[PDB]
Amino acid sequence: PERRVRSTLKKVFGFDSFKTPLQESATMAVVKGNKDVFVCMPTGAGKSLCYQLPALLAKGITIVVSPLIALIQDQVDHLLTLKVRVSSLNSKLSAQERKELLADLEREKPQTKILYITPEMAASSSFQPTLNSLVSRHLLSYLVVDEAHCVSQWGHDFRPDYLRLGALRSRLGHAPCVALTATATPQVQEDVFAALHLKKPVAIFKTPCFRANLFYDVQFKELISDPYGNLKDFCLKALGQEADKGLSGCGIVYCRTREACEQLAIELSCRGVNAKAYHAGLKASERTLVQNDWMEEKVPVIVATISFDKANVRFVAHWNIAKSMAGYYQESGRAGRDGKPSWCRLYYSRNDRDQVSFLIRKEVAKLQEKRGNKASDKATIMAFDALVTFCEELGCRHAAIAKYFGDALPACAKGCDHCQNPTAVRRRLEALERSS
Ligand SMILES: [Zn+2]
């Protein structure tokens, strides 16, 4: 019941109301138990609560399998801080403590409401008697697979144990299963659905990556005579939306190369807008100084490399195409963190695209040399291809981002490069074709 889950959420996690409505629906679906559940919510979006609360309110016990020992310990400690009866069965646990946890499990009603487990030892022969004892007694109310993307090779991070967890789902079938992930491409979604042996009916419960307060546009460097002047104008316009407000908030600028990024920062400083460079090339003390300046209002817009949060960000500009489409989305997510509208820009270049594709080729060659994973090797270049295709698409850029993440394509009434003055973006694309 809705009232029961509401009261349980307030009593356990001290949460008066769910942070998101979609996560509330996901929690309803999981506690219902009629069908398996999937969730793709970004870190810090309450994805944990979706699987924690049903376990709290479940008549049995919920097994939560997570790839890292540290992650398991962090979740268990977080729930213990909430006075929740949780256990952590892992190799890190001692023999006596492990036996005590097993004794707790063997009780008629297991003392540990939520049992976290590391997948590698979950396949261990020692755990299997406990696992099938749990299965026979029908005490396993739910199963949870955190970091579900690890099962898919196409995912950024992969775990073969997560391929095995299809077997664990085959076991304990009576218990509904909840797969959880931070970001999941539709390829990743299908890999998770087929590998974990999840039930035929599943609710994806993925938060729409689209944010109404975002403005995605991809200007062409070759099209603009002085792209640095264009970035100066974009920074000036985005820093202030209210004439009385004037310059406010702060933006971010991303660089493909650390060394050229310092030159970029100094020449934007001379442009009239003060900025600082953040990259490995810069000394650590200076890196911290520029980070602090960005966190404060001292620097209107900061300049950083591809590698790195603020309460409110005015804009996130990408002087060069990001290494991966998901990487570009993550970097642009910093923009529009607050409710105030924010603008995200990407400065394409055919030469820059060739350079980035060469970098991706070197990366995939290194993967083949060491990783030896053809699927992920093709996945990286597929992400780069998706980013570029998003770049040269005479369509809603939010729609393309949603397609890459697989969520239903948003429709931007306004505030999107294509959704307003689309013909202008198409003319820019035609000029790009004319140039190359
Ligand atoms: Zn749009």
The response to whether 40 counts as a known ligand-binding position is no
| Ligand 1: centre distance to CA 105 (Å) | 52
The response to whether 237 counts as a known ligand-binding position is no
* Residues in Cβ contact with 325 at an 8 Å cutoff, skipping those fewer than 6 apart: 383, 384, 386, 387, 390, 404
| Ligand 1: centre distance to CA 71 (Å) | 37
Torsions phi, psi for 427 (to 5 deg): -65, -40
Q: List strands edge to edge, sheet with 61-65.
A: 86-89, 114-117, 61-65, 140-145, 177-181, 36-40, 202-203
For the four alpha carbons of 307, 38, 406 and 165, in that order, the dihedral sign comes to positive
The domain segmentation of the chain, as residue ranges, is 2-203, 214-435
Dihedral, 8, 13, 15, 18 alpha carbons, nearest 10: -80
Architecture of domain 2-203: 3-Layer(aba) Sandwich (3.40)
The response to whether 46 counts as a known ligand-binding position is yes
- Nearest of 388, 362, 390, 392 to residue 377 by alpha carbon: 362
Q: How was this structure determined?
A: cryo-EM
| Ligand 1: centre distance to CA 226 (Å) | 26
| Ligand 1: centre distance to CA 144 (Å) | 35
How far, in Å, CA of 383 to CA of 360, rounded? 10
The response to whether 378 counts as a known ligand-binding position is no
Tell me the resolution in Å. 3.2
| Ligand 1: centre distance to CA 399 (Å) | 6
| Ligand 1: centre distance to CA 217 (Å) | 9
Residues with CB under 5 A from ligand 1 (ion): 396, 398, 412, 416, 419
The response to whether 412 counts as a known ligand-binding position is yes
* Residues in Cβ contact with 183 at an 8 Å cutoff, skipping those fewer than 6 apart: 40, 42, 149, 156, 326, 330, 405
| Ligand 1: centre distance to CA 223 (Å) | 22
Q: 243: buried, middle or exposed (CB in 10 Å: 19+, 13-18, 0-12)?
A: exposed
How far, in Å, CA of 102 to CA of 94, rounded? 12
- Nearest of 111, 125, 124, 116 to residue 79 by alpha carbon: 116
The response to whether 235 counts as a known ligand-binding position is no
Instruction: Tell me if 2-203 shares its fold with 214-435.
Output: yes
How far, in Å, CA of 434 to CA of 436, rounded? 5
| Ligand 1: centre distance to CA 375 (Å) | 31
CB 299 within 8 A of CB 276: yes
The response to whether 416 counts as a known ligand-binding position is yes
The response to whether 317 counts as a known ligand-binding position is no
CB 337 within 8 A of CB 311: yes
| Ligand 1: centre distance to CA 410 (Å) | 7
| Ligand 1: centre distance to CA 409 (Å) | 9
| Ligand 1: centre distance to CA 392 (Å) | 14
| Ligand 1: centre distance to CA 396 (Å) | 4
* Residues in Cβ contact with 31 at an 8 Å cutoff, skipping those fewer than 6 apart: 5, 53, 54, 57, 58
CATH H-level, domain 214-435: superfamily: P-loop containing nucleotide triphosphate hydrolases (3.40.50.300)
